[PDB]
């Protein structure tokens, strides 16, 4: 799949299969 825009500018997005996810929230 295509990798969408990563708004990592305040949201630490971890790498998943074509997915961007905020991780900070976890820890």
Swiss-Prot record:
Maturation and modification? Cross-linked via an isopeptide bond to E.coli host protein DncV during infection.
Q: Main role? A: Chaperone involved in tail fiber assembly and retraction. Acts as a chaperone helping to attach the long tail fibers to the virus during the assembly process. During phage assembly, twelve fibritin molecules attach to the phage neck via gp13: six molecules forming the collar and six molecules forming the whiskers.
Encoding gene, per UniProt annotation: wac
Species annotation: Enterobacteria phage T4
- Indicate where this protein resides in the cell: Virion
The protein, known as: Fibritin
Domain topic, free-text comment? The central domain consists of 12 alpha-helical domains (19-40 residues long) with coiled-coil structural patterns.
Which domain of life, per UniProt? Viruses
Q: How does it assemble?
A: Homotrimer. Interacts (via N-terminal domain) with neck protein gp13; this interaction allows attachment of the fibrous collar and wiskers.
